[PDB]
Amino acid sequence: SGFRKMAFPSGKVEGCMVQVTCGTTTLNGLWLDDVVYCPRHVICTSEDMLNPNYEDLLIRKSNHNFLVQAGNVQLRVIGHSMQNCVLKLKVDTANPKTPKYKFVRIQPGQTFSVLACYNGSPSGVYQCAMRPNFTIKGSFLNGSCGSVGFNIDYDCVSFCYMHHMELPTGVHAGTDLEGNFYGPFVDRQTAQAAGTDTTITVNVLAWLYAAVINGDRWFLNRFTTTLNDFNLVAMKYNYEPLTQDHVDILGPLSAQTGIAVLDMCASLKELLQNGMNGRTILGSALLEDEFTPFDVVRQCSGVTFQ
């Protein structure tokens, strides 16, 4: 029993974190085999951020201008290249702690664990989600750039996020491990405000299914809805449209609880109209949207508390 925001164990990623220094700037890097991946803005001054010409800044650098530190050992940079918004530093030592891994680009609504790091040293681990507006609600301070987001389904680490910046609203933006930003953001100091965000409907439904599995049904009702009528109501509360793919993805949770997806949609419709009336669902007074259907299946019992 219980339901917590659960992160993957971070040890496999902790063994990959290093510190990268270029002049006066120090940030984090991810060391996998003989390559250290980090944000390309490590080569910039504050002034450079207004309209940086990364190609022109980079050509003026040698391998020995990059200092990479893994614990108390200096690694030697023997090559460098830029791929989109990341810098790839070839080092003379392969990481002996390199886990089995892949680089995966995720979609909005997907969750992952973040290992917040400063000066190449991990400070904490927390869960989060790629918001519909392609930002993440992280907890990051100056010096956290290069910290990564990942999942570890079946002993292989899937790296999906590298941290680059904090936006004016206090939310965060970054790239996949190929250096492609999520959303329309650029690694430039410009007016690029996060778009209006919405609630991840499929995740709220998954979390209602978790509440039922854990033994709570108070929010259910005798009604159903069509997918289209549900979407017309959902969009009025700033909820993402629910697609047939989302209905398919909720199938196993629907089967385990005996509650049809459109029947859970009717419950969600009523919760949006009435609120919770002094009640809580899994210890929360708000509708939680940072648990996916896959996350609920991973954490919850396979036997519903009937």
Footprint on this chain of ligand S4X (rule: CB under 6 A): 1, 41, 49, 140-142, 144-145, 164-166, 168, 187-189
277 binds Na ion (CB under 5 A): no
Residue 60 φ then ψ, to 5°: -80, 0
Residue 105 near residue 160 (C-beta atoms within 8 A): yes
Close Cβ partners of 232 (under 8 Å, ≥ 6 residues apart): none
For Cl ion, the closer of residues 129 and 211 by Cβ is 129
d(CA 175, CA 182): 6
Q: Which three-class secondary structure state does DSSP give residue 241?
A: coil
Please confirm, yes or no, whether 145 is among the known catalytic residues.
yes
**195: which DSSP letter?**
P
**Smallest distance, Å, CB 26 to Na ion?**
24
Question: Strand pairing of 101-103 and 157-166?
Answer: parallel
**43: which DSSP letter?**
G
**Smallest distance, Å, CB 67 to Na ion?**
26
**Smallest distance, Å, CB 123 to ligand S4X?**
13
Catalytic-labelled residue, pool 16, 22, 38, 41: 41
Catalytic-labelled residue, pool 117, 145, 265, 300: 145
Among ligand S4X, a copy of itself, Cl ion, none, what does residue 12 contact (CB within 5–8 Å per kind)? a copy of itself
**Smallest distance, Å, CB 131 to a copy of itself?**
12
How many alpha carbons fall within 13 Å on the CB side of residue 170? 1
d(CA 174, CA 177): 10
d(CA 133, CA 246): 18
For Cl ion, the closer of residues 113 and 225 by Cβ is 113
Q: Tell me which stretch binds Cl ion (CB under 5 A): 102-110, 248-256, 258-266, 278-286.
A: 102-110
Among a copy of itself, Na ion, ligand S4X, none, what does residue 189 contact (CB within 5–8 Å per kind)? ligand S4X
Catalytic site residues?
41, 145
Residues that bind Cl ion (CB under 5 A): 106-107, 110
